[PDB]
Amino acid sequence: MGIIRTCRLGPDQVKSMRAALDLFGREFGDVATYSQHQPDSDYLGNLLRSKTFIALAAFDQEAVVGALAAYVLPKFEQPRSEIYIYDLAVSGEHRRQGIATALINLLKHEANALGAYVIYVQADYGDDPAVALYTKLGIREEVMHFDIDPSTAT
Amino acid sequence: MGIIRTCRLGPDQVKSMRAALDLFGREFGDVATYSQHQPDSDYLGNLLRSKTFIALAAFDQEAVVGALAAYVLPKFEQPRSEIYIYDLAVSGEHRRQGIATALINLLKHEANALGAYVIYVQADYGDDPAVALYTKLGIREEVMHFDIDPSTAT
Numbered sequence: 352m353g354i355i356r357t358c359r360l361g362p363d364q365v366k367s368m369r370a371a372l373d374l375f376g377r378e379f380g381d382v383a384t385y386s387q388h389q390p391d392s393d394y395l396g397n398l399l400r401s402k403t404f405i406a407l408a409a410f411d412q413e414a415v416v417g418a419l420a421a422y423v424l425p426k427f428e429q430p431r432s433e434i435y436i437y438d439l440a441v442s443g444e445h446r447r448q449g450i451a452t453a454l455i456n457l458l459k460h461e462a463n464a465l466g467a468y469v470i471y472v473q474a475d476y477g478d479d480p481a482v483a484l485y486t487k488l489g490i491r492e493e494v495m496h497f498d499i500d501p502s503t504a505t
Numbered sequence: 506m507g508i509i510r511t512c513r514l515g516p517d518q519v520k521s522m523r524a525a526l527d528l529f530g531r532e533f534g535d536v537a538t539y540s541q542h543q544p545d546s547d548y549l550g551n552l553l554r555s556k557t558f559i560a561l562a563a564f565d566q567e568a569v570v571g572a573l574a575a576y577v578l579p580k581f582e583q584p585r586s587e588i589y590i591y592d593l594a595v596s597g598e599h600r601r602q603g604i605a606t607a608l609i610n611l612l613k614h615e616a617n618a619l620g621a622y623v624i625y626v627q628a629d630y631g632d633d634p635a636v637a638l639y640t641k642l643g644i645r646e647e648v649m650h651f652d653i654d655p656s657t658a659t
């Protein structure tokens with residue numbers, strides 16, 4: 352394996368952001384969701400310009416082989432911030448070489464520069480790689496997640 | 506019980522937002538976290554002006570008796586949005602009268618006006634009221650939550 356470089360994507364890197372989205376679709380087995388309906392370049396540029404969205408990418412020979420998409424939540428109860436990892440994936444043939452760890456490490460540096468005091472993330476049962484990764488790097492709690500449909504508003 | 510009115514707070518309602526924060530602190534048993542270190546009025550005003558933060562309040566005789574604090578996440582894979590309920594509380598003596606349901610119903614209307622396709626939320630085991638509420642209004646999944654400390658960046 353070659354040198355792996357990581358960086359945070361800016362609005363000048365929409366093309367790499369789309370490559371990261373395509374990586375999510377391949378590694379999550381959901382190409383339609385991540386590749387067939389991507390936002391336009393103005394929208395992705397605006398998201399990448401914002402201080403409350405973070406996209407990190409890992410590169411191998413200038414191809415995206417890992418990606419992490421996170422939100423920064425400025426809190427309402429105190430002037431503090433939390434970072435919420437939404438999606439994280441590493442290309443299958445590049446797995447188990449520390450690339451996800453390097454992306455989370457870069458996210459930690461981003462957190463410290465923002466002053467965010469914690470990073471957190473969710474994983475499903477049966478997602479053994481993600482569970483093993485976040486158990487190594489973090490403290491694990493069992494919780495419940497609920498999805499609510501807005502279209503049934505009354 | 507009197508008439509209960511609900512609304513979404515704007516940047517002109519910082520005082521009610523602080524009352525909602527104080528309500529969180531009392532009902533969650535954590536007054537220091539929610540009342541002793543609140544952000545300044547510029548910060549709360551900026552948060553309430555933003556299109557990615559939602560604070561809803563329920564009132565009884567013009568006192569805040571329920572509050573819901575949520576984030577709107579514009580997604581990166583598609584031009585769509587999700588609403589993440591962060592905190593939700595109803596004053597203890599006002600519980601079991603549908604106030605939380607009315608706040609979630611108002612959040613559904615806010616979601617439809619934004620075009621957000623889903624609302625979701627997390628609850629802990631042993632938080633029987635929240636579990637019962639979100640089981641009634643939503644679909645429940647068991648998942649794992651991981652907290653990661655940025656201060657151990659390497």
Ligand SMILES: [Cl-]
Binds near residue numbers: 405
């Ligand atoms: Cl970014």
Ligand SMILES: [Cl-]
Binds near residue numbers: 558560
């Ligand atoms: Cl609001």
